[PDB]
Design a binder for this molecule. Structure first.
Ligand code: BCB
Ligand code: BCB
Ligand code: BPB
Ligand code: BPB
Ligand code: MQ9
Ligand code: UQ9
Ligand code: UQ9
Ligand code: NS0
Ligand code: NS0
Ligand code: NS0
Ligand code: NS5
Ligand code: LDA
Ligand code: LDA
Ligand code: FE
Lengths: 55, 24, 323, 273, 258, 58, 55, 58, 58, 58, 55, 58, 58
């Protein structure tokens, strides 16, 4: 076995076509999530500022 | 009624588009 | 059905071969006999038995204990033989009922209790030695001895150790059918409900665990008995289709498997752990926790329910209550 | 993903229902029709617990509880939060259990082994059914069943048992308890004995089947023998529930007094009373 | 002031709790589970992508090797690398990881699926003396049937069809268990004895009923090498054949109920 | 590739229709059921009953 | 075995016939959902604006 | 490498897309569910119900 | 294909009609029962019973 | 080595990226969950709910 | 054993390409965490100064 | 040896770095947790919460 | 023996480092813990906490 798909492999090219899409969609998902979080913020601003007493 | 409540639309809609577009 | 897993259809008879020990091949005792009925579930042959020293001793102390127990039980019905036999489950040998702390209590109130306790302890031990020695005699490993050990220790915990750490013999388990059981409730009531003690939990877990495991292992072997999977030791040294299937079966179901050898470890481990878990709980109780429920509430583990009938304030705490 | 010897056994067929469409493995798990079904219940049933627990008053894992409906609702459906979800889950539960058991049957068919395993698994299922279904039918309410909740369920067990005045005396219980103990002890011995023979310590040679026999015939003077222990294990295990089931069903439908009072039959035979 | 109080909220019980847990998991994981990987590991892959390492966390996984010194000479080392080199007569339905396989020829003879055996050591199973463990009652003359049972010697063996396959020649006994393992029957039509595991036949008063396989396929039950003793491998071979018939005797045994 | 932009489609070389399909099917349905149930467990956003919420009314 | 359908590869073409439909119908389903979601909104506006107290 | 800068991609030679892809699927589903239910278990931040909050009111 | 447009039909190559259809038959039956019994467990939208929903009255 | 300093990297020849990667994923997830849930179980430091913290007030 | 991959050391190169990325990603993560921790400080300054009594 | 003084290092020829490494990881993690939470279960030395200490004041 | 005075070292031939080392490690760890917590359960000798002792005070 002296290659990358060395002597009749069960087969994975150097396919980083997968890597391309995988990263795209991972970012898209995270991007969408950001926007969505912003939208919600305007619906229900969730953290709150620090109250009268606190500390 | 959906007034600045686009929240569900944003969630449902946005992916709907890039799902359409990324995998053409 | 396959009848050959449930009972044995055709029984075999023939010369049984004795494995010669390291010592005490001489102290085997009795004419070995057969039981045809017993032969339908297991081996039919019933003798002989090893004797030797540990045995002698175990019997010695054991019997003395039994004698003291029974004798005192008789004395409870004033020796009326008929009544004895009718009332037997309700009779017992009780530990001390007054508070003497840890002083050796008077004969008539717990004294005899204590003596039998000590002798029972001694027999257990002598026996332990038997188990352990015999193993070594025949060149086996000592696993059984160690499991047995834990069991014994738990007996110690509820018998004298716990009494000791809180410092009163009054907390001992009594001898007798029903009364050893009444102990359970008392003990639980006193330490604020045992369902709420975590080690009681653990223990039970492992105990049910054993149920599950034996049922499973048991069933598994029978299911593969057709390939001679009951021949468990040869399967360890030379893996056959039998246990290959057995493994596969479990893998395809819960998604990981054991080996023919290691399943035994699991079982052995679970068994042990019942007794250990128990011992811990017992040791903690009285010593560090006074009321297990309240403790679970302090750590907010305890479920709380709304009132069905109106909620009831304790009358003791009202204005102008008696005593 | 495969054990070194796994492949030769991974063949098609021996599904109980719906043939080839579900006949596949996801990783090490075999799916099959009932695989699919199980999952569905597990997923739905668990989710349902969560949602239900969300509208509880706590999120402590011990303290969470989904209780069944009040007694007034009879054998009917209750409002979803006032006992309905209980009902829901209980079905998903049964669902899951049974799908689990049948899956096992499919598996064993495929391997040409016996069905002992599935069947054995049937016993606890039955007890579940006894406690959640039958006994409540016989008393005519769901409110007689037990709630889902780690500590919560024990509270049920606890009170139930004090409803007859000292459950320890209930004879079904006695038997079951005895089995529970014997089983545990026996697993210990079986465990140990194999292990001792296999791993005899030092460079001592692994021992034979005869040494297993000798060992016990020494200590207690009888050896049940190698196959039969397996057989016997299965038996002990199983009567934990088989006998108990009797004591459980009895309490309420067939006995309403304290359990100790029941031994009166013997205590009171007029001859020696 | 309280016994067992480490703070205003922290008590010795509470700490022990975790402690207990810790141990349990440790044993389970760092021990028991390792011990479990003494057979069939490391995992093998006939589709996936450049993998010399199972579920991750695990290629340590395998424990260091034991060495069973055997009762009648020799050593075995565990885990091992025992390679399967039989060439299986199984075609795949799909090329897929976990899609099932179809037998190409006769599955009962090609020994696949429920009809597959393990390649055990080609030696005779032995007693503590050094005799053969599994033998017939022609050899173990000292052994006998218990008085009160049916001697199956002489009876007709009826197969799945309702057709007499042949007649019982002998029983075979385990000498170190006092237990009967095999019926040796005489397959009628040919001049041969075949060995059936006793777990595959319901013994009656008049007949031995064999649900496992059909009458015609008794002709092809694997042949014994010697006449009076059986090797460990031959045992597996014989057993697997009948069990394989539980899926492969009739075409309908394949199929689901509907 | 019949006028394709991406390699996307190669996913089905790797993944198997049958399994993806059967999976989605379960998944979607469970979630579906979940939401329906949940909603109809409430007071607001239960259709199917009289306005239990007693929203201000009593 | 030197291909994707490597010497009688057992019946899965370069089929992006499946991809096509899969992706269409995945969009349709999400699109439908959007429309439906909108309609429900009109019948029961479910998020609700932030009340008199809150914060 | 078709215009690549790192070797990032070689991960997929080692790790198996299917394992990752499928696993994230489950994982995300869970966290999703966690947050959703968690939120709908409060007072502030529950949509789906009439304001149980009693936000300042008593 | 007999005047077709899509390859959609190719599904029945991958799926087996008979045992798809057997499965849906069951599946639907369950949903069916569910909805029915559900409805008939209310007060509004229970046919099979007097209106004990007591709509406003009492 | 592509102009390194330490042997550091040899670790991956010994250890297995896959294991490390998967493990870390889990480990971190748990710690994360602990902190989050832990925080959200206090009275200070809980976003999500009204300040039933009652900081000094009552 | 007479080589680095001595008669196939079973196919993981001298890849410290992994090591390279691994470290980069591990630092980014740790860094981002700092930034984040700093912002949150501004929302809820969590340690608190030592109270009027204490010791 | 590459400029060494002791035999120390021969430990790794006896021990197995992988299993040391993994075990440390756990142990430290445990002790870490133990302290952290232990501390957060006192009154003095709790950050995360309003001073329940009531140090002498009440 | 490399300039040794005793036989002591032959222990390692009888005994095995790896077992010793691992056992000690644990034993010590437990004792350590015993002491630590034991102390932190008194009233003198508890750092970590307010002076619960109320040493003579009250
Ligand atoms: C109201 C009171 C209850 C109670 C009271 C209780 C107490 C007080 C204790 C337990 C304990 C246990 N409980 Mg519980 N319990 C258990 C099960 C268990 C066991 C797992 C475990 C006891 C260990 C054991 O197996 O003893 C059987 C094994 C024994 C006794 C060892 C015997 C070995 C010995 C060597 C025997 C050989 C003797 C010789 C032959 C000598 C012959 C004598 C001669 C000399 C006269 C279940 C399954 C349930 C259910 C289902 O509700 C339950 C409910 C209750 N328990 C009620 C809540 N239980 C123990 C425990 O775990 O506590 C934390 C324990 O201390
Ligand atoms: C104060 C009240 C008590 C009490 C009340 C009591 C009741 C009312 C009952 C018992 C029962 C039993 N009690 Mg008792 N009990 C027992 C032991 C026992 C068991 C032998 C027996 C059956 C347990 C059972 O029903 O499992 C239940 C297990 C079931 C139903 C199976 C569930 C498994 C399911 C099929 C599969 C689950 C899968 C999971 C959901 C999957 C999730 C896992 C992960 C991997 C996803 C002991 C040893 C003691 C002691 C030592 O005191 C004791 C004390 C008491 N019991 C107290 C006195 N007990 C039962 C019995 O048989 O009574 C005669 C019973 O009804
Ligand atoms: C999870 C762990 C489980 C576990 C584990 C294990 N358990 C073991 C072992 C392991 C590993 C053994 O190795 C050992 C053994 O070997 O078994 C094969 C044993 C044992 N566990 C026994 C009983 C048991 N295990 C129980 C429980 C659990 N175990 C827990 C649950 C329970 C319960 C639950 O109540 C019971 C009752 C005995 C069989 C045996 C002790 C013998 C003894 O210690 O002897 C002591 C000797 C005597 C008492 C002398 C007998 C005297 C006679 C009767 C005569 C008296 C008459 C007198 C008046 C006059 C004299 C005249 C005379 C000639 C007539
Ligand atoms: C006497 C007979 C004994 C026995 C026998 C056998 N035991 C078996 C088998 C045999 C033969 C198997 O073949 C089978 C198995 O696969 O081997 C591991 C199995 C199994 N026994 C499990 C648990 C187990 N055995 C118990 C008891 C005994 N076993 C008795 C003692 C107990 C007790 C006593 O509490 C438990 C908890 C699972 C691990 C496993 C099935 C997983 C499952 O069922 O999948 C299907 C379901 C799930 C994976 C989750 C279910 C989620 C549902 C939908 C909803 C949530 C649950 C809800 C009902 C809330 C309740 C919680 C509340 C109480 C707080
Ligand atoms: C990669 C790819 C193509 C992806 C796309 C595909 C995709 C996403 C498809 C859709 C997914 C679908 C449809 C389904 C998902 C998979 C599926 C069916 C999952 C079911 C999973 C599920 C619910 C699992 C939970 C497992 C479970 C219920 C319990 C865990 C086990 C527990 C707690 C057991 C109790 C503990 C216990 C007793 C341990 C015992 C130890 C063992 C191993 C005992 C068993 C055992 C015994 C008892 C023996 O006697 C024995 C004798 C001789 C040899 C071996 C053994 C042996 O192993
Ligand atoms: C092979 O290596 C090994 C050996 O050989 C070397 C060993 O010997 C050994 C072990 C050595 C030994 C001596 C084993 C013996 C150890 C034991 C604990 C045996 C003791 C067993 C008992 C005492 C029996 C238990 C009895 C009790 C606990 C008392 C119960 C009290 C009562 C009132 C019970 C009342 C009810 C009953 C008795 C039965 C009720 C039954 C039913 C209601 C239904 C029955 C169900 C069935 C028959 C199954 C259904 C039928 C079919 C499926 C065909 C091991 C471990 C090892 O593995
Ligand atoms: C495609 O998506 C789907 C799958 O694949 C993903 C599935 O696998 C499945 C699973 C469907 C199957 C038939 C799986 C195969 C069948 C089995 C494994 C047998 C086990 C199934 C069960 C025990 C129950 C399943 C049947 C149902 C849930 C039908 C529901 C019936 C009714 C009346 C619900 C409506 C509620 C009422 C009328 C209120 C009155 C009724 C009650 C109060 C009863 C609740 C109280 C109890 C104690 C329940 C006990 C009774 C039972 C458990 C039957 C579904 C549903 C899904 O469509
Ligand atoms: C050619 C080739 C074969 C085919 C290529 C075809 C293609 C491109 C296939 C890939 C397409 C797709 C679908 C890619 C999808 C990528 C995805 C889904 C990436 C997802 C990444 C998700 C991540 C990183 C999630 C991180 C989540 C966390 C850190 C959660 C933390 C939660 C907590 C700390 C607790 C909070 C909970 C609480 C209650 C407060
Ligand atoms: C075989 C080949 C040759 C021929 C091709 C034949 C063809 C084209 C077959 C295809 C036809 C069909 C039926 C295609 C179907 C495609 C489908 C069903 C796609 C479905 C996609 C579903 C998706 C992406 C679902 C995402 C769901 C979520 C993110 C749910 C999240 C839920 C939460 C976060 C929690 C909310 C719960 C709560 C608040 C209680
Ligand atoms: C294969 C090769 C050729 C191709 C290369 C492909 C590449 C570059 C793969 C690498 C990409 C990725 C994803 C790299 C990821 C690296 C990562 C995730 C590193 C993560 C490191 C995480 C660390 C060090 C975490 C330390 C955590 C702790 C110390 C937690 C301590 C917690 C406590 C003490 C208790 C506090 C809890 C409390 C409640 C008080
Ligand atoms: C330091 C000093 C002064 C003393 C130390 C003493 C010491 C070691 C005390 C510790 C005592 C211990 C361990 C006590 C333990 C007591 C326990 C666990 C008792 C538990 C259960 C007993 C039960 C159920 C017994 C009931 C017994 C009977 C009904 C009668 C006995 C008869 C039999 C079992 C039948 C056999 C008789 C037949 C052959 C005729
Ligand atoms: C309460 C007692 C229960 C103790 C827990 C039992 C351990 C279950 C075994 C899980 C095995 C994990 N796995 C898949 C990595 O092998
Ligand atoms: C399975 C038995 C249930 C009881 C276990 C008690 C759990 C304690 C962990 C909860 C955290 C609260 N604590 C201890 C800090 O107060
Ligand atoms: Fe066994």
């Amino acid at each position: 076995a002296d290659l990358k798909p060395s002597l009749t492999g069960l087969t994975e090219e150097e396919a980083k076509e997968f890597h391309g899409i995988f990263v795209t969609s991972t970012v898209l998902y995270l991007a969408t999530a950001v926007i969505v979080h912003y939208l919600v913020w305007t619906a229900r601003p969730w953290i709150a500022p620090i109250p009268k007493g606190w500390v | 009624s959906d007034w600045n409540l686009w929240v569900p639309l944003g969630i449902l809609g946005i992916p709907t588009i890039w799902i359409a577009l990324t995998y053409r | 059905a396959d009848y050959q897993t449930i009972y044995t259809q055709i029984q075999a008879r023939g010369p049984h071969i004795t494995v010669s020990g390291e010592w005490g091949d001489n102290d085997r005792v009795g004419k070995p006999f057969y039981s045809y009925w017993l032969g339908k579930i297991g081996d039919a042959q019933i003798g002989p038995i090893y004797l030797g020293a540990s045995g002698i001793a175990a019997f010695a102390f054991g019997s003395t204990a039994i004698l003291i127990i029974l004798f005192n039980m008789a004395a409870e019905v004033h020796f009326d033989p008929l009544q004895f036999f009718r009332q037997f489950f309700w009779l017992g040998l009780y530990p001390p009922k007054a508070q003497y702390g840890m002083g050796i209590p008077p004969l008539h109130d717990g004294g005899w209790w204590l003596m039998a306790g000590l002798f029972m302890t001694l027999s257990l031990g002598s026996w332990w030695i038997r188990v352990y020695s015999r193993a070594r005699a025949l060149g086996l490993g000592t696993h059984i001895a160690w499991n047995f050990a834990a069991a014994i220790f738990f007996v110690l915990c509820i018998g004298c150790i716990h009494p000791t750490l809180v410092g009163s013999w009054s907390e001992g388990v009594p001898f007798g059918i029903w009364p050893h059981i009444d102990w359970l409730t008392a003990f639980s009531i006193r330490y604020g409900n045992f369902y709420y003690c975590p080690w009681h939990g653990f223990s039970i877990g492992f105990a049910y665990g054993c149920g599950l495991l034996f049922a499973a292992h048991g069933a598994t072997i029978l299911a593969v008995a057709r390939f001679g999977g009951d021949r468990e030791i040869e399967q360890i040294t030379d893996r056959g289709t039998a246990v290959e299937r057995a493994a596969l079966f479990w893998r395809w179901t819960i998604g990981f498997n054991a080996t023919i050898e290691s399943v035994h470890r699991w079982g052995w481990f679970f068994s042990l752990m019942v007794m250990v878990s128990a011992s811990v709980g017992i040791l903690l109780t009285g010593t560090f926790v006074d009321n297990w429920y309240l403790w679970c509430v302090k750590h907010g583990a305890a479920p709380d329910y709304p009132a069905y009938l109106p909620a009831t304030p304790d009358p003791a705490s009202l204005p102008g209550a008696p005593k | 993903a495969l054990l070194s010897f796994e492949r030769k056994y991974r063949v098609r067929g021996g599904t109980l229902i719906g043939g080839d469409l579900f006949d596949f493995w996801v990783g090490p798990y075999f799916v099959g029709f009932f695989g699919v079904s199980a999952i569905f219940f597990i997923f739905l049933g668990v989710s349902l617990i969560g949602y239900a627990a969300s509208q509880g008053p706590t999120w402590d894992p011990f303290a969470i509880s989904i209780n069944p409906p009040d007694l007034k609702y009879g054998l009917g459906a209750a409002p979803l939060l006032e006992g309905g979800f209980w009902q829901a889950i209980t079905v998903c539960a049964l669902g899951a259990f049974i799908s689990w058991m049948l899956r096992e049957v499919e598996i064993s068919r495929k391997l040409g082994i016996g069905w002992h395993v599935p069947l054995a698994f049937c016993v606890p299922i039955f007890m579940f059914c006894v406690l959640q279904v039958f006994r409540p039918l016989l008393l005519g309410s769901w409110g007689h069943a037990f709630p889902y909740g780690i500590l919560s369920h024990l509270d049920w067990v606890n009170n139930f048992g004090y409803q007859y005045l000292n459950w320890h005396y209930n004879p079904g219980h006695m038997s079951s308890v005895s089995f529970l103990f014997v089983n545990a002890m026996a697993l210990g011995l079986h465990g140990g004995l194999i292990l001792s023979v296999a791993n005899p310590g030092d460079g001592d040679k692994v021992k034979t089947a005869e040494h297993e026999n000798q060992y016990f015939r020494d200590v207690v003077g009888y050896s049940i023998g190698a196959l039969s222990i397996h057989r016997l294990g299965l038996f002990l295990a199983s009567n934990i529930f088989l006998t108990g089931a009797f004591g459980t069903i009895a309490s309420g439908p067939f006995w309403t007094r304290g359990w100790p009072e029941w031994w009166g039959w013997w205590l009171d035979i007029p001859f020696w009373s | 002031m309280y016994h067992g109080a480490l703070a205003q909220h922290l008590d010795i019980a509470q700490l022990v709790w975790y402690a207990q847990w810790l141990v349990i998991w440790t044993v389970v994981l760092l021990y028991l589970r390792r011990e479990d990987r003494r057979e069939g590991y490391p995992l093998v892959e006939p589709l996936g992508l450049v993998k010399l390492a199972p579920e991750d966390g695990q290629v340590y996984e395998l424990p260091y090797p034991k060495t069973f010194v055997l009762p009648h000479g020799g050593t075995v080392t565990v885990p091992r690398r025992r390679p399967e080199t039989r060439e299986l007569k199984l075609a795949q339905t799909d090329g897929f990881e976990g899609a099932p396989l179809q037998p190409t020829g006769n599955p009962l003879v090609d020994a696949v699926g429920p009809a597959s055996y393990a390649e055990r050591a080609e030696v005779v199973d032995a007693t503590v003396d050094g005799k053969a463990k599994i033998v017939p009652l022609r050899v173990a003359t000292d052994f006998s049937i218990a008085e009160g049972d049916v001697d199956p010697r002489g009876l007709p063996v009826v197969a799945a069809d309702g057709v007499e396959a042949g007649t019982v020649t002998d029983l075979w006994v385990d000498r170190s268990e006092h237990y009967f393992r095999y019926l040796e029957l005489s397959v009628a039509g040919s001049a041969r004895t075949a060995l059936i595991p006793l777990g595959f036949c319901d013994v009656k008063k008049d007949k031995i009923v064999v649900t496992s396989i059909l009458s015609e396929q008794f002709a092809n039950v694997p042949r014994l090498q010697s006449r009076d003793q059986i090797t460990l491998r031959e045992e597996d071979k014989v057993s697997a054949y009948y069990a394989g018939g539980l899926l492969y005797a009739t075409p309908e045994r394949a199929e689901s109920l509907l | 590739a019949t006028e394709y932009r991406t390699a996307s489609w190669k996913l089905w070389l790797i993944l198997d229709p049958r399994r993806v399909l059967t999976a989605l099917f379960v998944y979607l349905t469970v979630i579906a059921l979940l939401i329906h149930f949940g909603l109809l467990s409430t007071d607001r956003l239960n259709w199917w009953e009289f306005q239990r919420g007693l929203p201000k009314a009593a």
